[PDB]
Design a protein around this ligand. Structure first.
Ligand SMILES: Nc1ncnc2c1ncn2[C@@H]1O[C@H](COP(=O)(O)OP(=O)(O)NP(=O)(O)O)[C@@H](O)[C@H]1O
Ligand SMILES: Nc1ncnc2c1ncn2[C@@H]1O[C@H](COP(=O)(O)OP(=O)(O)NP(=O)(O)O)[C@@H](O)[C@H]1O
Ligand SMILES: Cc1cn([C@H]2C[C@H](N)[C@@H](COP(=O)(O)O)O2)c(=O)[nH]c1=O
Ligand SMILES: Cc1cn([C@H]2C[C@H](N)[C@@H](COP(=O)(O)O)O2)c(=O)[nH]c1=O
Ligand SMILES: [Mg+2]
Ligand SMILES: [Mg+2]
Ligand SMILES: [Mg+2]
Lengths: 209, 209
């Protein structure tokens, strides 16, 4: 019985990392085999270049960094397929949607061109989108010093996210991320239990293909 | 007056590097401003990963290495556009065609998926293809120990090359690379002088777009 591939997406500070950690903990406490993955995955050679870029320790041409983000997902595909075939559910903090939304937010980058590198990746069985007002997300303390952490850019990324949601080949679920950590968690948990059960009766699909 | 973007392609051992070096030398001796570029460009962080892969000092998932090859071209785009706008002709030893032919030679890689990352790159004004029998290319000493240096794979890459040649948006010129170094050089040189002159009256295009 394969595991489910569940992705958490949203703008910066929507609660993705807190909710991904809490989900894996709750699923394992409920007897599921579940593990956490995140993108970018900074531990690889590619991920190190991406971390340096995000921290502005380095500058990378926009097309080149978009491709490195996608390559960073493909390098984990063998692992992802192996885990899911063993019955392990994978909870993923950001995936190809973030890749398209962030580059697509820059001038002169079509959503079409941004999607291509990720075409064929393992298709998530469930894509949770943690919806929150950009304003309420900024009330969450304050902006960090990483690339893209500014209001204007976040608003353009959000717009791109909404375009990808029109894709009904994907099981998108909206989450009200403005609620308490525990309330948001319970919403996410119940959606996730359903996917693990029922979304997996079919073979793992291929994204945007 | 912009410079021309001339690319040399062909299978391994077709003479690309010898002919690219000789072309730049002859063009500069004839008063042109011309410089040599090559792909992969191993001097960058990306290029170092690619060199390690090619030498089999490392293994990289096939989709991920295809994207790193393309990223390695995009990281040079600002330089390429700057040089060409200054009137410098650029002679390039391998480009996106090699990228598509080599990955497209592997199982389960569509030419369409392989082309996407490079869509939008600076479009070559002239693409020279150094045609030589795979057999005569092997009579050129012997195979090196790098990845892909085997007959079966070379034959599949050649097939992919022939598919890309059906693209009439590109100024492809076949060269008989079985001739002497000097004879092949003179053919390439005269084709190149013509492109520099006449192919550049129009703005630099965008590849596969
Ligand atoms: N529901 C919530 N209500 C209030 N604060 C929250 C909530 N969820 C998370 N936070 C806090 O907001 C901050 C950002 O949470 P985090 O889970 O790291 O968001 P994120 O979406 O992963 N951010 P990023 O990696 O920058 O896109 C942390 O201090 C969290 O403790
Ligand atoms: N026209 C030619 N006739 C005979 N030998 C040649 C010719 N051109 C090049 N060579 C020799 O063949 C070898 C390969 O030439 P080279 O120019 O490096 O090919 P290449 O196409 O760049 N190979 P690769 O980088 O592996 O794809 C070298 O020893 C050259 O001296
Ligand atoms: C997966 C991914 C993330 N990001 C951006 C979004 C975030 N601002 C940044 C770091 O994310 P996080 O803090 O979740 O590590 O990385 C991209 O620009 N492209 C991608 O493909
Ligand atoms: C530009 C490029 C080259 N190659 C392969 C073709 C060659 N066997 C190898 C090294 O080339 P060379 O010896 O020209 O450095 O690299 C690829 O597989 N993809 C690419 O995008
Ligand atoms: Mg986070
Ligand atoms: Mg060579
Ligand atoms: Mg397409």
């Amino acid at each position: 019985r394969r595991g489910a591939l569940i992705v958490l997406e949203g703008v910066d500070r929507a609660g993705k990392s807190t909710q991904s950690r809490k989900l894996v903990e709750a699923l394992c406490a409920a007897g599921h085999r579940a593990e956490l993955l995140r993108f970018p995955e900074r531990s690889t050679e590619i991920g190190k270049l991406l971390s340096s870029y995000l921290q502005k320790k380095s500058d990378v041409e926009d097309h080149s960094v978009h491709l490195l983000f996608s390559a960073n997902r493909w390098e984990q595909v063998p692992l992802i397929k192996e885990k899911l075939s063993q019955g392990v559910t994978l909870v993923v903090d950001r995936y190809a949607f973030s890749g398209v939304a962030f580059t697509g937010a820059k001038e002169n980058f079509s959503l079409d061109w941004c999607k291509q590198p990720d075409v064929g990746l393992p298709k998530p069985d469930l894509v949770l989108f943690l919806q929150l007002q950009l304003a309420d997300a900024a009330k969450r303390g304050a902006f960090g010093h990483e690339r893209y952490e500014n209001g204007a850019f976040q608003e353009r990324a959000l717009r791109c996210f909404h375009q990808l949601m029109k894709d009904t080949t994907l099981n998108w679920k909206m989450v009200d991320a403005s609620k308490s950590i525990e309330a948001v968690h319970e919403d996410i948990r119940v959606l996730s239990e359903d996917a693990i059960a029922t979304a997996t009766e079919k073979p793992l699909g291929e994204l945007w293909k």
